[PDB]
Amino acid sequence: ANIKSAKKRAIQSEKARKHNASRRSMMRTFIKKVYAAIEAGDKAAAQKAFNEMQPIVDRQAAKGLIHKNKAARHKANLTAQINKLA
Amino acid sequence: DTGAAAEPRAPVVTIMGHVDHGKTSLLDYIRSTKVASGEAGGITQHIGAYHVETENGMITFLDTPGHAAFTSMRARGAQATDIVVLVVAADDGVMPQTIEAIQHAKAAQVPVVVAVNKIDKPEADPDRVKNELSQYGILPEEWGGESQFVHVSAKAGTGIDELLDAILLQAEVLELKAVRKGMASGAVIESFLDKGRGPVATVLVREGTLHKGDIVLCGFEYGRVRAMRNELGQEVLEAGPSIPVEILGLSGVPAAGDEVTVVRDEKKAREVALYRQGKFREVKLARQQKSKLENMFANMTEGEVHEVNIVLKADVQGSVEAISDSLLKLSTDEVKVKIIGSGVGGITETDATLAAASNAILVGFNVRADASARKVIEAESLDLRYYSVIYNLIDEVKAAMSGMLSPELKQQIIGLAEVRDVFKSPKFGAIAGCMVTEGVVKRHNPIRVLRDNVVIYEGELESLRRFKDDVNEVRNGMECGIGVKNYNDVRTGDVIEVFEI
Amino acid sequence: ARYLGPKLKLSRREGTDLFLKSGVRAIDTKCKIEQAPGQHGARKPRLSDYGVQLREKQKVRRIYGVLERQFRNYYKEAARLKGNTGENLLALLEGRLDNVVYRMGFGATRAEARQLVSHKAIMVNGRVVNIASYQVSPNDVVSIREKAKKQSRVKAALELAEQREKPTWLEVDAGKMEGTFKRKPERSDLSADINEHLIVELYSK
RNA sequence: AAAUUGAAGAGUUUGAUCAUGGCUCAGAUUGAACGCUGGCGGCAGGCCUAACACAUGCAAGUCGAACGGUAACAGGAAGAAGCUUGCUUCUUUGCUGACGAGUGGCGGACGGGUGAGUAAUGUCUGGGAAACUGCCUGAUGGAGGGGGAUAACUACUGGAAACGGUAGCUAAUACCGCAUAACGUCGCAAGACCAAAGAGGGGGACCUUCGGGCCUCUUGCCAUCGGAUGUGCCCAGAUGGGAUUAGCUAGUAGGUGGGGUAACGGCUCACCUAGGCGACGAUCCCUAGCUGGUCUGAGAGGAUGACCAGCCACACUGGAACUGAGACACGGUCCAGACUCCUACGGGAGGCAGCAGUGGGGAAUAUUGCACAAUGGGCGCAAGCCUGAUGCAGCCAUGCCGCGUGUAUGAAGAAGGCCUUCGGGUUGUAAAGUACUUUCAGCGGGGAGGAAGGGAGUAAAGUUAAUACCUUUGCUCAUUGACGUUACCCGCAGAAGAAGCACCGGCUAACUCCGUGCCAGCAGCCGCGGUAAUACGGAGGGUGCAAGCGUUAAUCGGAAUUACUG
């Protein structure tokens, strides 16, 4: 970049990018564990997995990695499905 | 120009000679640059001015190459400079280009000092130079003619101390007149065209003064100065009568050289600039009417009507006027060559269009092809050739001209045959029986029919036939037969001369 | 921006006195008043309908010292204004300062009055107005400023003025060299061999 | 009170006529150009062409009151001395006024440029419902206790440069756990789950580890529900032409369910139904940013979309997402393309449709200027710093408006020119002469306003333990204008420095002589030119405009000549 701060911003945005990427990848992992339990038909594994997932979709919302509404749908959606089976 | 203030200035010096006296070397060594032989051609084909700071005081140097082609540059460089230097070599002695520089020194009434270039070579002696140039009134030594000789190595870098001293003294002995503040005026060294910067000019200012807001008028061109550049220095705030500064912001590329005068307001200088254009345009149409009416006939009296056209755009303004004069020297009565639309720089759409209408070669001393220029040149059939030096150009234009010629002078004879006992044919109207006395007769080779040493008729054979064979070749002392179209009368005793081309 | 040439030519072309000289002289002893200027002045113009309209507009313009652009703009304003356009044109002309200065007798001619104005010799409401076309309003007081009061042109100008018909809508004190634009002149105040409707016709076609 | 209360026709077909019908003119208008000419000023306008390419400067920073900090300069200091004993120079130490480089915060999504693309994820009018929304704002509560890092820096090392490699080492309002957790999110509910950060100003007992504790106020941080502003989304109508384009469509149209977004939605995927669009113009092709408005017209219309303002779209070309409240980013990143610059040859760098400026194209369009003083934007508690936004200045008669280039007097009415039947007529009161004025330009002298604020003190209130500090409001003192030689006013000199352009046969205001002789030439239309040419060219005279005047280009008018009105 040409301007002093523009240079600095590219550096900061890359750091943030690697920070966000790391936390975001983690989060989707814990979401995916729940969908995987559901697809195997286990209430407990899927409830257990939902309980681990809950606090982290909530936290990443508070931290701006995602919006509150996204966290809610995930909880709403998974909760809907797990109940529909056991 | 009021107050009559008189201040000393740095003397402007020009150097002349036969090519190769290491005229450039003298400058580069003083400048501690050595740009010599770093450029295409190995010699200096351009003019430039460079000011250096050396004790005592200040001095600037200007140089022009000496060649048959640059008639104008050496003429203008002499009258502008207060002191002229003439380089001479003991090995070279005096040459017709050097004596040409002698006239420029005396006619411009400029005092002259000279230097012997080679003290290094053992076959080089000063006494030869002094005596042989003694015959000419210029360059006396200790005879009471006030002129002083200097002996320098020019390679060795040997003083020089004497030459420098003479130059300072020669400028010192004569009163140096200038003014620090007043109405600026001067002459233009060299002008060229740039793509980003725009049209520019290198200007020696006689009275030294300048400002970004001041309006400057060069020739029929006018405008406000946007920026100032001095040599390597990219920007200068102020410029004195001594040191030269490249001028920028003028409307268009001015003449190769002329008197430049600044004005208070631009509006007052607009009508004046347009006035000079009207006169230059009136004489342009005047010289156009004369040359066409001069023949006093609707066409040329003879067959020289065949001509070649050329299109030239050179980056520098100084060349187009100078080399064209040398380009008109190679002109001859047989083939006439003329320049059309000499440009200030580069290339353009209307220039490629100019070469499209009339077939011509598009050449430039130094040029690059524009993005819009490539599209036109690549599409229609044309020729784009750029040449670093003027010598490679002056040779090939001649080459173009030499080729244009179509002369058949024969032309060695292939065979000579005499015809006897004519026969009649329906197709060609006649068949002349022949006997070849010498050589071999061929089909498509041209023939010359002559009677009593004068040529009755001329042509090219259509049918060579012996008996019913109709062979394409007949040797000597073998009965042969011949007929041709458009030949009415066959008489015995005449001889037909066939010749290959 | 001003007509600077011979003046009686204008009167001679329009067929009438245009008051372009002081009036000290019978105009017929200064020029051949009843003959147009030029080689062919004696010739009569068998004059077209357009011609009579043109000459009438020229006449008024030449009386007031107004060139075409400004005068056309005067028509435009007269038209825009309420009431009869032809009469509005003459109100606007007659309200000009160079004009009013002339009518109070401070200048022998409108040309002289205009020079008085331009040369900062005239005040309006004790305030210096130096542009000729300044529109003067009811109750305004225009005066010769103190320094210009001893100019002999002005005394002579007031003498001649005293010998012209005296305009109703102006109250002039010759001693003080001040005067008051009481009201806009009516149509009936102004000469009756001006044909405004012709000028109105010229500018509507 | 007033505020669309407005409308013209002429020449030209014919021997002549009436009708038909086209061509042409008078008018307004212009971002104009060219030709001749050119004094001043105020206000405006100024690449319409190549969304062609761009050298150089400048156009986005700021905060030490978040943080480790010193390298510059500035003081200060135990202690070195300049020592001529209070003046001091340098060795030192961030002690502090400040501040390069660094982390961090907020801004680089605004301001400014352009109109390429787009006949619709556009615009205009009018409505909807499923949403987010930095800074500013109201409400109610938090602001507890910890942890591992890292740039800078240090050491070693690679590069021509750009910029790197190792290992050390350290701070925070950088970063992450843990606690706390509802009028929040999920859930019928029971329950389950989510955050944070300090930094400054001043200070009374009181005292220590002299750091501060503690007292107090300012400010920032977290949560939730609002306000305001901004933005996303959906529907209807309108918004160019072409059928010498009539059929178009597989995410296509809908349904179910999963996923997805801030949010509704074929947004996406699977499955199912077989629909959906179209002569009320789909599809395809050409062209084009839309509007307020602008020009013209009595109007209805016609033409149009510079300058100002609103919306959209773009940022070298094609594609992409990252950061962020906001971007798929005008001076950010990545890939590919076109192109250019640097290089020590191994490798690097850049994108003016920001402001100046350059080349190129063109009939044609400006200075590489001054200033943040004013308004407004970014950061900061502030002081202030930045701001080619903006305010101004330069250039061009490009346009609009104003003014000047003198005023008055001046006759047998001169000389000269021009016409003349040689009587005289005209140029012409024109000139000369005579008085007289002095705008503008020139030169000196003086001198508003655009300035509100901000700075020291002071006093009062609200604060509080407090007269501190903070903040508000009065007081005084000294100050802030790029323009600028400002506007404007006074003085001096003299008519002194300031008039050209087109036209004069009819249309059409303005007539004669000489030259030419179907030539040279004119010509908007008719039509002029072969011996009297008011039509060519010169002259005298005249007409119309006037710092302009003509010619060319261009829209509408007249044209009821696309006729809805008609």
Domain ranges of chain A: 1-86
Q: What kind of fold does domain C7-93+190-204 have according to CATH?
A: Ribosomal Protein S4 Delta 41; Chain A, domain 1 (1.10.1050)
**Experimental method for this entry?**
cryo-EM
Closest CA to A54 of A83, A76, A39, A86: A76
State which nucleotides on strand D lie below 7 Å from a protein beta carbon: 7-8, 26, 28, 36, 38-39, 50, 52-56, 60-62, 101-108, 131-133, 175-177, 184-187, 192-196, 222-224, 258-263, 322-325, 329, 331-333, 350-352, 357-362, 366-369, 394-397, 401-411, 413, 418-419, 425-430, 436-439, 488-491, 499, 507-512, 540-547, 549
Sign, CA dihedral B351-B352-B354-B358, equals positive
Q: What kind of fold does domain C94-180 have according to CATH?
A: 3.10.290
Q: How far is CA C47 from CA C34, C41, C63, in A?
A: 17, 14, 22
Residues of B from 203 to 232 whose C-beta is within 7 A of strand D: which are they? 212-213, 223-227
Query: Can you give the length of chain C in residues?
Result: 205
CA/C1' separation A31–D322 (Å): 23
Helix (H, G, I), strand (E, B) or coil at C142: strand
Task: Identify whether the C-beta of residue B200 lies closer than 8 Å to the C-beta of residue B230.
Answer: no
CA distance B269 to B271: 6
Residues in binding site of B for GTP: 17-24, 63-67, 117-120
Task: Identify whether the C-beta of residue B88 lies closer than 8 Å to the C-beta of residue B116.
Answer: yes
Residues in binding site of B: 17-24, 63-67, 117-120
Using the CB atom, is residue B196 less than 7 Å from strand D? Answer: yes
Task: Identify whether the C-beta of residue B152 lies closer than 8 Å to the C-beta of residue B117.
Answer: yes
Query: For B280, what's the count of Cα atoms within 13 Å in the CB-facing half-sphere?
Result: 10
CA distance B259 to B216: 11
CA/C1' separation C73–D552 (Å): 28
Using the CB atom, is residue B234 less than 7 Å from strand D? Answer: yes
Shortest CA to C1' contact from A23: nucleotide? D176
Q: Which residue is nearest to nucleotide D404 (CA to C1')?
A: C1
- DSSP, res B305: T
Q: What share of chain B is helix, strand, coil (3-state, %, to 5)?
A: 25, 30, 45
Residue B436 sits at the vertex; the CA angle it makes with B430 and B437, to the nearest 5 degrees, is 140
Q: Are strands C122-124 and B245-248 parallel, antiparallel or unpaired?
A: unpaired
CA/C1' separation A7–D332 (Å): 8
**Backbone torsions φ then ψ of B496, nearest 5 degrees:** -100, 130
CA distance B236 to B229: 6
Closest CA to C188 of C66, C103, C91: C91
Where along chain C do the CATH 1.10.1050.10 domains lie?
A: 7-93+190-204
Closest CA to B8 of B298, B208, B236, B277: B208
CB < 8 Å & 24+ apart, contacts of A11-19: none
CA/C1' separation C85–D402 (Å): 25
Residues of C from 28 to 57 whose C-beta is within 7 A of strand D: which are they? 30-32, 35-43, 45, 47-48, 50-51, 54-55
E strand or H helix at B415: strand B413-423
Residue B478 sits at the vertex; the CA angle it makes with B474 and B482, to the nearest 5 degrees, is 55
Using the CB atom, is residue C191 less than 7 Å from strand D? Answer: no
CA distance B483 to B431: 4
CA distance B187 to B218: 9
Structure-token pair, residue B470: 């109709």
Q: Are strands B221-224 and B215-218 parallel, antiparallel or unpaired?
A: antiparallel
CA distance C11 to C18: 6
Q: Are strands B454-460 and B495-499 parallel, antiparallel or unpaired?
A: unpaired
**Rounded (10°) CA dihedral B398, B403, B405, B409:** 120
Q: Which residues contact B472 (CB under 8 A, 6 or more apart)?
A: B442, B443, B464
Residue with tokens 């700071």: B53
Residues of A from 38 to 77 whose C-beta is within 7 A of strand D: which are they? 51, 54-55, 58-59, 61-64, 66-77
Using the CB atom, is residue A3 less than 7 Å from strand D? Answer: yes
Shortest CA to C1' contact from C110: nucleotide? D407
Shortest CA to C1' contact from C36: nucleotide? D542
Where along chain C do the CATH 3.10.290.10 domains lie?
A: 94-180
In angstroms, this model's resolution equals 13.5
Q: Are strands B215-218 and B199-207 parallel, antiparallel or unpaired?
A: unpaired
CA/C1' separation B281–D36 (Å): 17
